[PDB]
């Protein structure tokens, strides 16, 4: 696409999230850059409202799949880049087993020469001393495949996947993801055959940043179609 050629270089990324979970409102602001050619990106996020009322790992999937490395033999199946620069809306339901639910609406688009992910997040019916609101999750992240299928009737795609969050006691907190994406603009986009993205996320801290924050390195690649 014309859209994919916008990602040949190193693209600045701005992430802005406004959140409201069980009436706890918060905001997050991330800045970094993405290298789609190689399928890696680096971001640093600050909670600008003080202490984050949920664990950072529970926000990772919400906080730019346009930066995936698609292999040349799969380029015809990159919806995310095809929708650029005007971008796409991305919506999820994230259902935390035996706990509450996030509902997210994001717009991913270029503002000037920056790729911006603007998100609204509403979380309902969380337990005040469960794993999320009690901050009982480990500050780490497992690798996962996101299985993507076309949604022809919406000129977009959908995806389903389970995220497994390690709990401090060694148990596992599941977060079932249901995702849908739709072009912001009108213009044609690539509607893909079934395939998946493989993602690895690496979380760290900056000892010199007193604000509640998350340093993040992500690898993302596409697979599952064979020329």
From Swiss-Prot:
Effect of residue 163 to T: In P11; increases fluorescence at 475 nm excitation and at warmer temperatures such as 37 degrees Celsius. In Esmerald; leads to brighter fluorescence. In VisGreen; leads to brighter fluorescence
Protein's UniProt name: Green fluorescent protein
Pfam family, one: GFP
Outcome (variant: residue 143 to P): Increases fluorescence at warmer temperatures such as 37 degrees Celsius
Assembly behavior: Monomer.
Biological process, per Gene Ontology: bioluminescence; generation of precursor metabolites and energy
This protein's UniProt keywords: Chromophore, Luminescence, Photoprotein
Stated consequence of mutating residue 75 to R: In Topaz; shifts the major emission and exitation peak up to 20 nm
Effect of residue 151 to V: In EBFP2.0; shifts the excitation and emission spectra to shorter wavelengths and increases quantum yields compared to BFP
Record annotation: effect of changing residue 199 to Y: Gives rise to yellow-emission variants. In EYFP; leads to yellow fluorescence, folds faster and more efficiently at 37 degrees Celsius and has superior solubility and brightness
Function noted in UniProt: Energy-transfer acceptor. Its role is to transduce the blue chemiluminescence of the protein aequorin into green fluorescent light by energy transfer. Fluoresces in vivo upon receiving energy from the Ca(2+)-activated photoprotein aequorin.
Known outcome of mutating residue 220 to R: In Azurite; shifts the excitation and emission spectra to shorter wavelengths and increases quantum yields compared to BFP
PTM comment text: Contains a chromophore consisting of modified amino acid residues. Maturation of the chromophore requires nothing other than molecular oxygen.
Effect of residue 65 to M: In Citrinine; leads to excitation and emission peaks of 516 and 529 nm, respectively
Family per record: Belongs to the GFP family.
Tissue specificity: Photocytes.
Species, as recorded: Aequorea victoria
InterPro entries cross-referenced by the UniProt entry: GFP, GFP-related, Green_fluorescent_prot
Known outcome of mutating residue 64 to N: In R10-3; matures to the red-emitting state with excitation and emission maxima at 555 and 585 nm, respectively
Application notes: Green fluorescent protein has been engineered to produce a vast number of variously colored mutants, fusion proteins, and biosensors. Further generation of mutants led to more stable proteins (at 37 degrees Celsius for example) with brighter fluorescence and longer fluorescence lifetimes.
Species classification: Eukaryota, Metazoa, Cnidaria, Hydrozoa, Hydroidolina
């Amino acid at each position: 696409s014309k859209g994919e050629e916008l990602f040949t270089g190193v693209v600045p990324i701005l992430v802005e999230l406004d959140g409201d979970v069980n009436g706890h409102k918060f905001s997050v602001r991330g800045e970094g850059e993405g290298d789609a050619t190689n399928g890696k990106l680096t971001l640093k996020f600050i909670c600008t409202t003080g202490k984050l009322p949920v664990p950072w790992p529970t926000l990772v999937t919400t906080l730019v799949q346009c930066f995936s490395r698609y292999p040349d033999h799969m380029k015809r199946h990159d919806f995310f880049k095809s929708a650029m620069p005007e971008g796409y809306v991305q919506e999820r339901t994230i259902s935390f087993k035996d706990d509450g639910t996030y509902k997210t609406r994001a717009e991913v688009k270029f503002e000037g020469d920056t790729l911006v992910n603007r998100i609204e997040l509403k979380g309902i019916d969380f337990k005040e001393d469960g794993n999320i609101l009690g901050h009982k999750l480990e500050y780490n992240f497992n690798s996962h495949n996101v299985y993507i299928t076309a949604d022809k009737q919406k000129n977009g795609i959908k995806a389903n996947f389970k995220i497994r969050h390690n709990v401090e006691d060694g148990s596992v907190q599941l977060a079932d993801h249901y995702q849908q994406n739709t072009p912001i603009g009108d213009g044609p986009v690539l509607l893909p055959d079934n395939h998946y993205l493989s993602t690895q996320s690496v979380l760290s801290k900056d000892p010199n940043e007193k604000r509640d924050h998350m340093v993040l390195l992500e690898f993302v690649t596409a697979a599952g179609i064979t020329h």
